Design a protein around this ligand. Structure first.
Ligand SMILES: COc1cc2sc(C(=O)CCC(=O)O)cc2cc1OCCOc1c(OC)cc2sc(C(=O)CCC(=O)O)cc2c1F
Lengths: 173, 178
């Protein structure tokens, strides 16, 4: 299926390559400077809405800083750069958490495919595929311990506070 | 279909975002960063599509006649919560009989490695013998998508190949020369 392949590709092509190096980047950041929490918090909106700016989705999510970049030679790209961003999570005007956060970009592929006729992908099948992307990613991570411990999957449907969604996960350690 | 979705994702999640900005980066390199005496880096991103799904990280290892020249100026864009997400791309010189025959921006289409890994892992439910058919479908779907994205189609060239002694530099040069 479309979503099964996308979850495998997001793991093989991205998570497998950044998650074993994330802990050291967060520690380096924290040693230089409350501490940024460990783990990459991966946003998984089941509606497949992937905005580029997080403060726009929720003003209680405020950009703090970029984590020091990771570079690696990848598929002929010398020093391919992996950038990740750190956000503060506010609750009633107070800082309640600080974490590395981003959306799983393959969910945007499902959104685009449901818009373009040539993709042969209907909007009516998009939610089932979004759920299958999340489930497959959870299944893969259950067999990759170092990656599983370095990320947290944040799946949600809006009928909303995105910061409260992230904080609930951050608060379960 | 695994490869159909991967081609759509490689276009939507990568090529659509870098190809409209590539021409300016190559021009900037040629005007201000290229060695004054060398020939101009060719336009277009040359995308390697090995149908065996073998994606090495170092190109000079695949063929010594492919030599790393320089990294293009990086492109940055806010992407999915990543502020100033960085897109880096590499320039290579292609040698023929010890002399420089071409210079271009070159990389492998990384989703072909996903097909390779899926064909290896039991949990991927992707049989070993399905690799080639999926690789061909990935290439065909990507060609189909690009045929409807004019700026992108003119900013890249798809280099699909099967190995039987093979020369990857000759494969790239044949495309560069057309
Ligand atoms: C190879 O497969 C994937 C690689 C990456 S790298 C990547 C990220 O860096 C996250 C941030 C971003 O999407 O820009 C996400 C994915 C997803 C992947 O699986 C879905 C396939 O569609 C996508 C894709 O779908 C969203 C995104 C990208 S970004 C990208 C590159 O930067 C090229 C070099 C490299 O692969 O490291 C390639 C793809 C891409 F192929």
């Amino acid at each position: 299926s479309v979503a099964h392949g996308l979850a495998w590709s997001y793991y093989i092509g991205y998570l497998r390559l950044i998650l074993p190096e994330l802990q050291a980047r967060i520690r380096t950041y924290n040693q230089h400077y409350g501490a940024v929490s460990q783990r990459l918090y991966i946003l998984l909106p089941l509606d497949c809405g992937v905005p580029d700016n997080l403060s726009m989705a929720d003003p209680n999510i405020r950009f703090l800083d970029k984590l020091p970049q990771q570079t690696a030679d990848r598929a002929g790209i010398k020093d391919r750069v992996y950038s990740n961003s750190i956000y503060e999570l506010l609750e009633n005007g107070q800082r309640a958490g600080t974490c590395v956060l981003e959306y799983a970009t393959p969910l945007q592929t499902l959104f685009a495919m449901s818009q373009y006729s040539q993709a042969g992908f209907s909007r009516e099948d998009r939610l089932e595929q979004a759920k299958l992307f999340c489930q497959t990613l959870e299944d893969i991570l259950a067999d990759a311990p170092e990656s599983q411990n370095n990320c947290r999957l944040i799946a949600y449907q809006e009928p909303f506070s995105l910061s409260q969604e992230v904080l609930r996960h951050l608060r379960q350690e």
